[PDB]
Amino acid sequence: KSAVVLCMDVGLAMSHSNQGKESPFEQAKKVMMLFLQRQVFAESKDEIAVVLYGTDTTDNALAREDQYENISVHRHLMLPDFDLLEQIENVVEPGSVQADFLDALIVSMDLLQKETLGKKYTRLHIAVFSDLSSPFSVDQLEVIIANLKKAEITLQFFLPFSVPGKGLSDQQKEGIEMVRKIMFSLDGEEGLSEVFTFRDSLERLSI
């Protein structure tokens, strides 16, 4: 069995609808449901957690006085079930704020570190879904990468555009370059291959 964290941006910008009938928030919610349905129906043994960033409330183990704010652990590492399907579809809504995606990545790594203790997994995996419009701080990023390597975590980034231009903001361009630096540190030239579109996300998650 493998262990997977789905780390999803629900900040206010994800709710902006200018690429078809579904906003990026709606599209990512849809991919997450299809993936979780596949896992339930095949009776897979993999365990799946869900971390949301950009939420109006704060609920995570690291939140303390202006730190790791507006990040919520919606589902801990467990087998997926039908209650989770109901929650995702009805409860989970867009936030009215924005949050820091490296904060969210650390919350996800801390979750895997604690909740895989003493068990054997074939792989540990974090999948991030975002449009990269929110600002972030790079403080301690070298520590994040060192622990991704030691723990042998496989990382995948999914974006609602491929990388005529798309009108990406400077903040989005900075986020994309930071994703490239992270993936090259882990896997080299081949590492940049592990950056994908929402369109291709369901199939890449599954292999």
């Binding site: 490296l102 650390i106 570190q113 600002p135 701080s137 301690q140």
Partner: peptide
């Protein structure tokens, strides 16, 4: 993008 300080949890030391 900024450099606002953050504290990583102790296990990542």
């Amino acid at each position: 993008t900024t450099a606002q300080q953050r504290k990583c949890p102790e296990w990542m030391n």
